[PDB]
Amino acid sequence: MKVFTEKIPNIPWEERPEGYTGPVWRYSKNPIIGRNPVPKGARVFNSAVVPYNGEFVGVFRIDHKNTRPFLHFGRSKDGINWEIEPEEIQWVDVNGEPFQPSYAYDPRVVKIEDTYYITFCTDDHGPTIGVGMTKDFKTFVRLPNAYVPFNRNGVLFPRKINGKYVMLNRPSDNGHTPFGDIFLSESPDMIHWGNHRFVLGRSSYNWWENLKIGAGPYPIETSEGWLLIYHGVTLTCNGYVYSFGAALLDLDDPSKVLYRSRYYLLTPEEEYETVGFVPNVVFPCAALCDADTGRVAIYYGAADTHVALAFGYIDEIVDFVKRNSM
Amino acid sequence: HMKVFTEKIPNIPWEERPEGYTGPVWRYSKNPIIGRNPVPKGARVFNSAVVPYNGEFVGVFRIDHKNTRPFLHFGRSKDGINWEIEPEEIQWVDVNGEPFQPSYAYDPRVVKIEDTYYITFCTDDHGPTIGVGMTKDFKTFVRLPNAYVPFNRNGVLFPRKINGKYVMLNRPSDNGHTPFGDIFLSESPDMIHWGNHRFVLGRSSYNWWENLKIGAGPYPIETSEGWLLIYHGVTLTCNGYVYSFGAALLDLDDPSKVLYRSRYYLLTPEEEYETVGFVPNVVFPCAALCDADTGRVAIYYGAADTHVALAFGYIDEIVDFVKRNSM
Numbered sequence: 001m002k003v004f005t006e007k008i009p010n011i012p013w014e015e016r017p018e019g020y021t022g023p024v025w026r027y028s029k030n031p032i033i034g035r036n037p038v039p040k041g042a043r044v045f046n047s048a049v050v051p052y053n054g055e056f057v058g059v060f061r062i063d064h065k066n067t068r069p070f071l072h073f074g075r076s077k078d079g080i081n082w083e084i085e086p087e088e089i090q091w092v093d094v095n096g097e098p099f100q101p102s103y104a105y106d107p108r109v110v111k112i113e114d115t116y117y118i119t120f121c122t123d124d125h126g127p128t129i130g131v132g133m134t135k136d137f138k139t140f141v142r143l144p145n146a147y148v149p150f151n152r153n154g155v156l157f158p159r160k161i162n163g164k165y166v167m168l169n170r171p172s173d174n175g176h177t178p179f180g181d182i183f184l185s186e187s188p189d190m191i192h193w194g195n196h197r198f199v200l201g202r203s204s205y206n207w208w209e210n211l212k213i214g215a216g217p218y219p220i221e222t223s224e225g226w227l228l229i230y231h232g233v234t235l236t237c238n239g240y241v242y243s244f245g246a247a248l249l250d251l252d253d254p255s256k257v258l259y260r261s262r263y264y265l266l267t268p269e270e271e272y273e274t275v276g277f278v279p280n281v282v283f284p285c286a287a288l289c290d291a292d293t294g295r296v297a298i299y300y301g302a303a304d305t306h307v308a309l310a311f312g313y314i315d316e317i318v319d320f321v322k323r324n325s326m
Numbered sequence: 327h328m329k330v331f332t333e334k335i336p337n338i339p340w341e342e343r344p345e346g347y348t349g350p351v352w353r354y355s356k357n358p359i360i361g362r363n364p365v366p367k368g369a370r371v372f373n374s375a376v377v378p379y380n381g382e383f384v385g386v387f388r389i390d391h392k393n394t395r396p397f398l399h400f401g402r403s404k405d406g407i408n409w410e411i412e413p414e415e416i417q418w419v420d421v422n423g424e425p426f427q428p429s430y431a432y433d434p435r436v437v438k439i440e441d442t443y444y445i446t447f448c449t450d451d452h453g454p455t456i457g458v459g460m461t462k463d464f465k466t467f468v469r470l471p472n473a474y475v476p477f478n479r480n481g482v483l484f485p486r487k488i489n490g491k492y493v494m495l496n497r498p499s500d501n502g503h504t505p506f507g508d509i510f511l512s513e514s515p516d517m518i519h520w521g522n523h524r525f526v527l528g529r530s531s532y533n534w535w536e537n538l539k540i541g542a543g544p545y546p547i548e549t550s551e552g553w554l555l556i557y558h559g560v561t562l563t564c565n566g567y568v569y570s571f572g573a574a575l576l577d578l579d580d581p582s583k584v585l586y587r588s589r590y591y592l593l594t595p596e597e598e599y600e601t602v603g604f605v606p607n608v609v610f611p612c613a614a615l616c617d618a619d620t621g622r623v624a625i626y627y628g629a630a631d632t633h634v635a636l637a638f639g640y641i642d643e644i645v646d647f648v649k650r651n652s653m
Contacts, residue, residue: 125525126498144523146521148474150498151475192514192520193521195471196471196474196475
């Protein structure tokens with residue numbers, strides 16, 4: 001199988017536990033960061049990480065000590081030990097005027113051609129998908145929001161498809177949405193979005209994802225299709241439980257689902273996932289894949305309190321998705 | 327004084343105001359004009375997106391069938407009051423001529439832009455959203471891709487491009503009986519891809535009639551005083567919603583800028599055909615005709631989700647009312 005990502009020789013990595021049978025396993029030293037990450041910060045738990053300049057950089061959601069979310073930039077030599085800026089990213093518009101979001105969270109980072117695009121959730125009389133970019137992680141330029149509210153889990157495909165930018169999104173409500181399907185939209189210019197298509201919806205049969213789902217890491221291009229890692233939610237009598245799984249989408253028409261695992265890849269089990277600000281959440285934010293070895297590192301938010309890592313091999317994950325497909 | 331940029335409509339449906347009547351808008355004394363069991367398969371007709379066509383009037387009508395499912399039907403009228411409605415729903419094809427039929431469709435609006443009549447409506451795509459269609463002759467109806475992902479309704483286009491862009495009013499919503507709602511606008515170069523969204527108008531805190539949600543009604547009418555937007559406003563009582571309608575004026579060049587907005591509704595449910603029916607206490611404006619020659623306005627509205635009714639007024643008096651009663 002072929003994977004169309006970067007060579008990442010120094011990807012964060014840990015071998016699977018002896019005799020471990022699952023496609024994806026936790027970093028034994030999780031969580032890697034979480035409470036009181038910076039002087040103004042209460043919890044860090046989203047981490048849109050990419051390789052950059054032989055190292056790693058990320059855009060992090062940090063809830064400050066008023067519980068309001070901000071996006072901070074961070075750097076890491078190894079992807080495990082992070083230096084995060086104490087202050088939030090400052091955004092300007094294409095004209096260079098300040099264009100600062102009221103609040104911002106749920107960051108995703110993906111390189112398309114020569115530019116890193118950053119999506120995030122922000123207010124515009126309700127949650128919607130904000131869109132920004134940077135070529136150097138120094139100057140952050142914010143574009144007009146992609147949608148009117150209410151929308152979240154916006155993430156871009158890592159290249160144009162048929163000459164169009166393609167945005168996964170997740171139509172929502174004003175509150176703690178009790179539903180949600182993944183759609184995609186296309187744009188000629190990163191501003192005007194159209195030709196929307198339903199991609200993937202909540203399952204009736206698989207209880208882990210029968211309440212709502214939403215895209216996580218940007219879709220990874222393989223010869224087997226776009227590998228989409230997505231979270232799925234179920235509602236118990238005591239609240240939501242967020243897990244994550246994966247699907248494979250047709251390369252030419254990503255709204256066509258080829259395979260989708262009936263079982264999650266990961267669900268809350270460890271203390272740092274089952275206890276915290278929002279208990280019982282594993283929320284995948286970014287995935288690195290070393291094209292040379294097939295090694296995959298997934299960054300996920302745990303309990304809305306910590307950043308954690310999980311590892312696997314891309315071909316095993318793809319196999320898991322196909323074999324557990326309905 | 328004031329200019330209105332619409333067609334001359336000498337035969338507009340019209341009735342003079344009752345003697346000594348003081349309000350800007352009055353109901354047609356012979357309301358409702360159509361409603362219950364309009365066609366063999368039909369239970370109630372109560373949206374009517376009406377435009378002048380060919381010296382007469384045509385419309386796209388929402389008819390709930392006798393399974394209470396909504397469909398859009400084409401209708402014709404010589405005078406705009408007496409309607410002949412097709413017994414079967416409009417059939418839609420895509421730009422390739424392949425069938426592209428909505429699962430269900432309601433809330434139609436019809437607006438001519440240049441040489442083409444655009445029709446927006448509410449349809450399903452895993453939730454309510456704004457569907458978009460077009461016709462040059464009202465014989466062939468071509469449907470474009472929906473303008474938005476769910477959940478959205480009250481989509482209505484501006485009757486011309488503004489700064490080279492098509493502009494769509496819309497109303498971000500819920501999956502259910504939405505307990506909020508602001509009017510936004512979006513722009514498009516091509517009627518397919520939409521961006522540069524902006525909040526236009528939201529629910530009022532002070533005016534209780536519109537404190538729950540609002541939504542665009544008839545397409546915005548271009549006047550020298552701005553875009554006249556007739557919009558519905560909702561309040562929640564302990565026994566349900568009450569829909570009224572009022573009006574705002576939007577800046578001609580940047581319609582997201584509100585110049586004036588009437589604190590009072592133009593119309594609220596008061597008559598039996600408005601306060602009794604499938605959904606009691608609803609007046610829901612769908613279409614406005616304005617005769618550029620005289621300034622006469624005829625507003626088609628749904629009454630209690632049961633009937634089509636008419637209200638009349640003069641555009642200058644309506645505009646005057648909006649300005650005078652602006653917060």
